[PDB]
Ligand binder design. Structure first.
Ligand SMILES: *[C@@H]1O[C@H](CO)[C@@H](O[C@@H]2O[C@H](CO)[C@@H](O[C@@H]3O[C@H](CO[C@H]4O[C@H](CO)[C@@H](O)[C@H](O[C@H]5O[C@H](CO)[C@@H](O)[C@H](O)[C@@H]5O[C@H]5O[C@H](CO)[C@@H](O)[C@H](O)[C@@H]5O)[C@@H]4O)[C@@H](O)[C@H](O[C@H]4O[C@H](CO)[C@@H](O)[C@H](O)[C@@H]4O[C@H]4O[C@H](CO)[C@@H](O)[C@H](O)[C@@H]4O)[C@@H]3O)[C@H](O)[C@H]2NC(C)=O)[C@H](O)[C@H]1NC(C)=O
Ligand SMILES: CNC(=O)c1ccc(-c2cn(Cc3ccccc3)c3ncccc23)c([N+](=O)[O-])c1
Ligand SMILES: [Ca+2]
Ligand SMILES: [Ca+2]
Ligand code: NA
Ligand code: NA
Ligand SMILES: [Zn+2]
Length: 805
């Protein structure tokens, strides 16, 4: 119930929200059907439109008008945005040359530069170039301020997940808005774009920027606008709030535009109909900047122009139907479209089996345009699993396609020509970032970055301490003129042991064998020095990784590689080696095929054993440092030490062997040497964070050897590829992966072919940031470089996407 007989007089777009049944006059009252009886009359005036004209200049104030051109309007804070231009001979903001804003130039009584976030739904990154002729205000923002060529959204590349990520710095799995549509089985409630459930605060986790501000004494405008409030009114409301007394004025504001998304769905991302929506959004930006100029705020406010996701060509005919795959299609509920989420239709149906649904959806049609995954097997870069609102079965849909349950769903619902929601590395899903104002840099281009990083920056722009989030604070310092955040490296929690030779060969009873009893004073001191760390500067180029949790581990040195060996997990946490451009690949010799050698630095009790592998009919083993890249026949023996062995399914070994034998050398050739750090990951509860020992669900049969869920590699070289990886003077370049450790290659539909036809395609799908690997291992990389720490944070957030231009 709402007692809509209260009044909005003096309350239009009030900031504090009033509680039922009292009627509301705030910017969301329409969405709740709760506005007072006179809200349209008082708050949504439209008389005479949005622009001053010559005949209105100096008019007698008429309170009915949408905006004013009377002499008093500047002090009332409610002139039309073009008032000074039409009536006082001023120029539009867009027609002024840009001039660097070296310091905030703010009116007296401003405690800080305000922040205005201008969010545009569906604004695909390539519109900045492709539409630049029809968007002069935006182009001036972009060319004069700080811009990225694009900004990566979060998955799924839908509106509600992305806007809430922008506001919180959190992945959707952590903030809880995991799609535009959701079912929460604990609440037993559904969240939908239409209707009232979405207003319940229980769906919305983390802490959004407007709450972070309020808690710390910075006032915020309300970020949401009911759809029927016209854009011109949203802008004039922001400008009016900016004219409030100091004690009442917010410091942070957001504008939201449903365009160009709304038209992009109907017409496709580059439909000829799209030009007009782009023109209109530009004109709104112009109104805001003209309005700031009239208030003498145009060199005071930081403006962020930012999109939630892009837009792809998608039509009804490019729909896959689960009814063409599944016998039991009436026993499932599908959340359809540009991603699929499957659960049981009835929790009382005990004949429902995820395994049989996955198998019926796997590589069934030659050009199949979706791929099924149990959610824990999704690429780790998506961070899309740790929430009970995310169904166990997920369908990744190819760009340009939809998935639906049955044909009748699609024609009893061709209308549309555009959609979004696909994998967030897809080029058409990328969106925009421009920052303009005193705290941003002048005419500066920055590399692409992820929208999870902006919350920290928006907190920095406002002097707020960010709530805990998934950005890496400091990684966007290069966007800013001032207000940089200067983090310190985390402290190492565990220091390594450096064991020497402590065990005789006969103390080991590991069931291993090796043909190495093949028998010099020059060469003996030499091998001793390698075991003491004499080649370590070649193979550990950026310092040893720091271990950020309590554990017991050993540093082990060798001619060709260095490792940090966990006495708890019985394998390395990391193995580091450098391969120069000139390195040669060799084979594993015949006499060494099944060679595993005890490591006399590490006790039998802290070692793996061969007999467990022999007995585990499912499980084989591989090596972290690859024997193929040994520097000499004699150094190759080091590669067969039991301390370099890790458990691997035979199907996985196909992938790993090709990576090690072919791809490492290929990258060394292309990049002028590479430094590689490889290791295991254990994430059995799919939370993106390192498992403790007591979370491990699977061991090599009969043993305490834990089975990794994933294997990572971090591959680092010099950004200036004219310098070798091991003698780099300047910035680094990196690519990384987190490969799922699976007992089959069902993910790769072409896996019966030669590895040259499918392995690298698998690795590109599982591309990762160094930061992803850090969360998953509790290690901290790049501790000893010549580079600034902020620069290294940016490197750790880089994702190599393999998307074309
Ligand atoms: C991305 O950044 C985020 C933010 O930093 C990272 O997320 C944090 O990770 C922490 C570890 O997973 C986690 O810390 C836990 O907090 C528990 C208290 O949680 C509440 O309070 C906080 C603070 O206000 C709040 O933010 C939480 O909000 C979550 O929960 C509600 C749902 O009820 C949601 O609305 C909200 O969206 C959010 O959900 C997300 O997180 C939860 C987990 O908290 C998930 O389950 C959801 O799926 C979703 O992803 C909460 O309201 C605290 O109780 C935990 O402590 C337990 O575990 C420790 C281990 O150290 C143990 O010592 C304790 O005894 C305790 O164990 C007991 O409970 C167990 C489970 O019932 C039981 O088995 C034991 O036997 C014990 O009884 C823990 O400290 C922190 O909450 C989240 N924060 C957020 C916002 O998500 C995230 O890791 C980053 N991602 C990456 C990849 O880096
Ligand atoms: C048909 N869909 C709509 O009309 C529509 C869809 C989404 C939103 C919306 C606005 N913010 C606030 C905001 C603004 C800028 C940056 C971050 C956050 C969100 N934060 C989370 C989820 C949805 C929204 C609104 N809106 O303005 O209320 C309308
Ligand atoms: Ca959107
Ligand atoms: Ca984990
Ligand atoms: Na075996
Ligand atoms: Na396969
Ligand atoms: Zn949309």
């Amino acid at each position: 119930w709402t007692a809509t007989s209260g009044s909005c007089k003096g309350r239009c777009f009030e900031l504090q929200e009033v509680g039922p049944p009292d009627c509301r006059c705030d910017n969301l009252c329409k969405s709740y059907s709760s506005c007072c009886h006179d809200f349209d009359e008082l708050c949504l005036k439209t008389a005479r439109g949005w622009e001053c004209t010559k005949d209105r200049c100096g008019e007698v104030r008429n309170e009915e008008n949408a905006c004013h051109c009377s002499e008093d309007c500047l002090s009332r804070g409610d002139c039309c945005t073009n008032y000074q231009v039409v009536c006082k001979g001023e120029s539009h903001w867009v027609d002024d040359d840009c001039e660097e804003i070296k310091v905030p130039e703010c009116p007296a009584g401003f405690v800080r530069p305000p922040l205005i976030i201008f969010s545009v739904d569906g604004f695909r990154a390539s519109y900045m170039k492709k539409g630049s002729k029809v968007m002069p205000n935006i182009e001036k923002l972009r060319s004069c301020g700080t811009h990225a060529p694009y900004m990566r959204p979060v998955y799924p590349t839908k509106t509600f997940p992305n806007l809430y990520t922008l506001a919180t710095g959190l992945y959707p799995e952590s903030h809880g808005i995991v799609g535009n549509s959701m079912y929460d089985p604990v609440f037993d409630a559904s969240f939908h774009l239409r209707g009232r459930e979405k207003f319940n605060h229980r769906w919305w986790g983390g802490q959004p920027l407007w709450i972070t501000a309020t808690k710390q004494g910075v006032r915020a405008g309300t970020f949401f606008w009911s759809v029927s409030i016209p854009h011109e009114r949203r802008i004039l409301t922001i400008l009016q709030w900016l004219s409030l007394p100091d004690n009442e004025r917010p410091s942070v504001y957001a504008f939201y535009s449903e365009q160009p998304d709304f038209s992009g769905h109907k017409y496709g991302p580059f439909g000829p109909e799209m030009t007009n929506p782009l023109r209109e959004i530009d004109k709104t930006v112009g109104q805001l900047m003209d309005g700031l100029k009239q208030l003498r705020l145009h060199r005071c406010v930081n403006v962020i122009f930012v999109g939630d996701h892009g837009m792809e060509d998608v039509t009804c005919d490019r729909t896959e139907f689960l009814s063409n795959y599944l016998t039991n299609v009436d026993d499932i509920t599908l959340v359809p479209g540009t991603l699929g989420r499957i659960r049981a239709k009835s929790i009382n149906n005990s004949k429902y089996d995820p395994k049989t649904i996955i198998a019926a959806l796997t590589c069934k049609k030659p050009d199949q345009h979706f791929k099924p995954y149990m959610k824990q097997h999704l690429p780790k870069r998506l961070h899309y699993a740790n929430n009970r609102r995310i169904e166990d079965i997920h369908l990744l849909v190819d760009r340009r396609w939809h998935v639906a349950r049955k044909p009748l769903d699609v024609y009893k619902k061709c209308f549309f020509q555009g959609d979004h929601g696909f994998d967030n590395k897809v080029n058409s899903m990328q969106t925009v970032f421009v920052g303009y104002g005193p705290t941003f840099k002048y005419r500066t281009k920055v590399p692409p970055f992820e929208n999870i990083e902006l919350y920290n920056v928006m907190c920095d722009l406002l002097g707020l301490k960010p709530a805990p989030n998934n950005g890496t604070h400091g990684s966007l310092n290069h966007l800013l003129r001032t207000n940089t955040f200067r983090p310190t490296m985390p402290d190492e929690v565990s220091r390594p042991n450096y064991p020497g030779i402590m065990y005789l060969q006969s103390e080991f009873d590991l069931g291993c064998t090796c043909d190495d009893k093949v028998e010099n004073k020059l060469e003996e001191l030499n091998k001793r020095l390698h075991t003491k760390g004499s080649t370590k500067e070649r193979h550990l180029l950026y310092g040893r990784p720091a271990v950020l949790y309590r554990t017991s581990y050993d540093i082990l040195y060798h001619t060709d590689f260095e490792s940090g060996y966990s006495e708890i997990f019985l394998m390395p946490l990391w193995t580091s080696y450098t391969i120069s451009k000139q390195a040669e690949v060799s084979s594993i010799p015949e006499h060494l095929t099944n060679c595993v050698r005890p490591d006399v630095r590490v006790s039998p009790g802290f070692s793996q054993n061969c007999l467990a592998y022999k007995n585990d009919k499912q499980m084989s083993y591989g090596f972290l440092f690859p024997p193929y890249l040994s520097s000499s026949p004699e150094a190759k023996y080091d590669a067969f030490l039991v301390t370099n062995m890790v458990p691997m399914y035979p199907a996985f070994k196909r992938v790993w062997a090709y990576f090690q034998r072919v791809l490492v050398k290929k990258y060394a050739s292309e990049r002028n040497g590479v430094n590689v750090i490889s290791g295991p990951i254990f994430d059995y509860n799919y939370d993106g964070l390192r498992d403790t020992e007591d979370e491990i669900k699977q061991y090599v049969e009969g043993s305490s050897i834990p089975v990794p869920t994933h294997y990572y590699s971090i591959i680092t070289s010099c950004l200036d590829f004219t310098q070798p990886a091991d003698k780099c003077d300047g910035p680094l370049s990196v690519s990384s992966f987190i490969l799922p450790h699976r007992p089959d290659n069902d993910e790769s539909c072409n896996s019966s072919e030669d590895e040259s036809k499918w392995v690298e395609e698998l690795m590109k799908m599982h591309t990762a940031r160094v930061r992803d690997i850090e969360h998953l291992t509790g290690l901290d990389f790049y501790r000893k470089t010549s580079r600034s720490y902020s620069e290294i944070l940016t490197l750790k957030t880089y994702l190599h996407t393999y998307e074309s231009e």
